[PDB]
Amino acid sequence: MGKNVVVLGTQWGDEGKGKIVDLLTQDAQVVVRYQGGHNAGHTLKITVLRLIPSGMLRPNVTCYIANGVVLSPQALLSEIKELEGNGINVRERLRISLACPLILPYHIALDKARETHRGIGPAYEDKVARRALRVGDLFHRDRFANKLTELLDYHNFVLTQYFKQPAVDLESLLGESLQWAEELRPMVCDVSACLHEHRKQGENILFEGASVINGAGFGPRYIDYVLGITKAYTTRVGGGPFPTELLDDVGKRIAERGQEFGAVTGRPRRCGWFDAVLLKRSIELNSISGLCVTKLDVLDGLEVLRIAVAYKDRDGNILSRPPLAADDFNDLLPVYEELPGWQESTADVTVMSDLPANARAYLKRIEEILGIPIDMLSTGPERDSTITLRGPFL
Amino acid sequence: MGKNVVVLGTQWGDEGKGKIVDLLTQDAQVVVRYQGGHNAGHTLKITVLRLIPSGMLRPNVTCYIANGVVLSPQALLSEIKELEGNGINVRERLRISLACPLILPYHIALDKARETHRGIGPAYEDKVARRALRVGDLFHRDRFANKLTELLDYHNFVLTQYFKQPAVDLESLLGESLQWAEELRPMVCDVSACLHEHRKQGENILFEGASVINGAGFGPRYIDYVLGITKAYTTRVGGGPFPTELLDDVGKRIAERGQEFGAVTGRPRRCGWFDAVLLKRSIELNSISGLCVTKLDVLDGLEVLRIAVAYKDRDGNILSRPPLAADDFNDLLPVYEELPGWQESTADVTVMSDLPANARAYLKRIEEILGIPIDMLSTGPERDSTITLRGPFL
Numbered sequence A, B: 001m002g003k004n005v006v007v008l009g010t011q012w013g014d015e016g017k018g019k020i021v022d023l024l025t026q027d028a029q030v031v032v033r034y035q036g037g038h039n040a041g042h043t044l045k046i047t048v049l050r051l052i053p054s055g056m057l058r059p060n061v062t063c064y065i066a067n068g069v070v071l072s073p074q075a076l077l078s079e080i081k082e083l084e085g086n087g088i089n090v091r092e093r094l095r096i097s098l099a100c101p102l103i104l105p106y107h108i109a110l111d112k113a114r115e116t117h118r119g120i121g122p123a124y125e126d127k128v129a130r131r132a133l134r135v136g137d138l139f140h141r142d143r144f145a146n147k148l149t150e151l152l153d154y155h156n157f158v159l160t161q162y163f164k165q166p167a168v169d170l171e172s173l174l175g176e177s178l179q180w181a182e183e184l185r186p187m188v189c190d191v192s193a194c195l196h197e198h199r200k201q202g203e204n205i206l207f208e209g210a211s212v213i214n215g216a217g218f219g220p221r222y223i224d225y226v227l228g229i230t231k232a233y234t235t236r237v238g239g240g241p242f243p244t245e246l247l248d249d250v251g252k253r254i255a256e257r258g259q260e261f262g263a264v265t266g267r268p269r270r271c272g273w274f275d276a277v278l279l280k281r282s283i284e285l286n287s288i289s290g291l292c293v294t295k296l297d298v299l300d301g302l303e304v305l306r307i308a309v310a311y312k313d314r315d316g317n318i319l320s321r322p323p324l325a326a327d328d329f330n331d332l333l334p335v336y337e338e339l340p341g342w343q344e345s346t347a348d349v350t351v352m353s354d355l356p357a358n359a360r361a362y363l364k365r366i367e368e369i370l371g372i373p374i375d376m377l378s379t380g381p382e383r384d385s386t387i388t389l390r391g392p393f394l
């Protein structure tokens, strides 16, 4: 019997999940995308993949895009064709749920009309409202066209009347969708049934978070281990509350050493100390089994490190979890523990005993505070600069 | 340490879940509603409850309405006041997530406008579109009013312009919402944090399905047992595919003995044989641990029983799971096994060894086919006409 592993980030993104997933695919026979869309990409060896799991570059791996993914058919076909150019037999090992909702031009438009008071949101809205076109509809061209015209009679009304923005042309959408069914046909399937047959065959399955139960049709007690990818410090891209934010020379050093810059904008990310209050909530929500702590090497050379172990709100109440309401972060302050840093390099160290004593004590304290083990550790950007203390597929 | 149990029906509703949940609450210190709304009710002793869990009638139980529930504030307050009339101290033991989306008059209207080409759907639509008013907004009356007027500027446009139906009056909605904050205030909280503190205290928690992970903020590996409430035959209320449907005197007998009539309409439900193809998919999707088979007594006196173990599609392909697409049920037929019935009464039998041999063989075969145990069995409508072979909280 195999093991079923979910991998997700525990903070506010940018936790270094890509190379950890790539490493874990050496042990998986099956990799599953079950949530999200094509918002964030992953760069690897040959090419950026946003919908196709990176397990595709292992010859034995079957990759699944499960029903919880909303997909733009043209974004998917471009990724496919790109990998086909590099000589990957994609269509033999990529499988796509017939129940994926499509992201179409009008979803993107409603996104744009609303931003000025990538379609993923409006697509999920159509799905919840029981009106979304799906992959399976491509195979009934009569129904696809009927439902598309009828959906466009509404979304175009909303776009031009309410938002005073341009409509989406029905005829050009039918024209662009002409080849989608034939392009996707050999890959479409009942993904959940496939996953349960793999489970029956004892194969290892990796669920790659961009929930599993609804998004892949895969019940919760079959999940054997949840790996929480957790950077050794915290970053944030957007505005809003950041209790451990560093606005000084230490934060600037972290940003530089960790290359914490927007991949498209070049804008530096906000940086701050490790925040265990944030992590406690992530562990509870996701029943995280163990952590993969990443970018330890970025902290080399700091004289002291801090860990936020509580928050103190405006009244001086001590909080062990982040407040639900963003109002409560006003006049809210972190409560820190202080640990000594290390001067020795941890870059690309691959055995725990080669780490400096203060680095191991930092990691041990995170384990003590959070109550779950650090089962993996990344000490560099290279896939193999990774210590596996306990394998998630054990 | 306690156990965390999810209870759900495995078929198309009407599986007899109410009295099983009531029985299980004797072992739970905490009962959680995490999905759905006030669509279906449960009748019990003193009164129909649609939002408040029936654990409220046990003095030690804390009841939670978690963030995944969309709630009409006036429907909730009426249930509360009703139970208060029967002298239940509701407000001390009922807890409500600040993050529940509200169901408001305009949601119901959009329901009505769409049916003619109870608001639960449009409320979830608002939530997905990141625009839903929530319980927590009642406590910022300035923001509640600002967001309500702005939301109504849209939903009223859609109602009158698109659907040519009446608008919803903003001022009367503000008037009706005037007392909601003060009414709900002592009960509102961070439900997920509460559930994890109960979990830490080792208390038994019952999740009552009307998912758990998102709807209650409660990670999948903390779920210890999923109980699948499973009627000994199948019923359906709506139209559409029903492969084991019985259109004869046997189905009519089942309908009568099982009182299979719409609680409001009086219309008889469609009845049919036990369908293990349906059940296999339910078990996979929900990782069901064990079954509670209900209404065994309804089958007393039948000469033969059938169980659908596969489907045969139009081409004669043999299917082990129901097809995803409703098209594929056209010219689709069940594949049956036949078992002998029993003449002896099973009504209110409470020890397995008092059951007739053919009844135990029927149940054993369902276990063999489905590969999970029958851990509970209901033989009558009374809460205690129930055999517990293995307790879910074990």
Ligand SMILES: Nc1nc2c(ncn2[C@@H]2O[C@H](COP(=O)(O)OP(=O)(O)O)[C@@H](O)[C@H]2O)c(=O)[nH]1
Pocket: A014, A015, A016, A017, A018, A019, A020, A041, A042, A043, A257, A258, A259, A294, A295, A296, A297, A298, A378, A379, A380, A381, A382
């Ligand atoms: N210094 C350092 N960089 C890392 C580490 N892990 C990942 N990175 C880098 O951090 C960035 C984000 O990691 P990843 O999610 O794997 O890449 P992405 O999927 O392309 O965003 C990439 O530029 C990685 O090379 C690590 O432990 N140390």
Ligand SMILES: Nc1nc2c(ncn2[C@@H]2O[C@H](COP(=O)(O)OP(=O)(O)O)[C@@H](O)[C@H]2O)c(=O)[nH]1
Pocket: B014, B015, B016, B017, B018, B019, B020, B041, B042, B043, B257, B258, B259, B294, B295, B296, B297, B298, B378, B379, B380, B381, B382
């Ligand atoms: N004959 C019979 N009736 C049952 C059994 N279990 C439940 N019922 C009845 O079936 C109906 C549905 O059960 P339940 O879900 O507990 O009640 P509800 O929540 O009020 O819909 C009710 O009228 C119950 O009394 C059983 O094993 N045998």
Ligand SMILES: [Cl-]
Pocket: A066, A067, A097, A098, A099, A189, A190, A191, A192, A193, A217
């Ligand atoms: Cl699927």
Ligand SMILES: [Cl-]
Pocket: B066, B067, B097, B098, B099, B189, B190, B191, B192, B193, B217
């Ligand atoms: Cl909550």
Ligand SMILES: [Mg+2]
Pocket: A013, A014, A015, A016, A017, A018
């Ligand atoms: Mg990353």
Ligand SMILES: [Mg+2]
Pocket: B013, B014, B015, B016, B017, B018
């Ligand atoms: Mg019922």
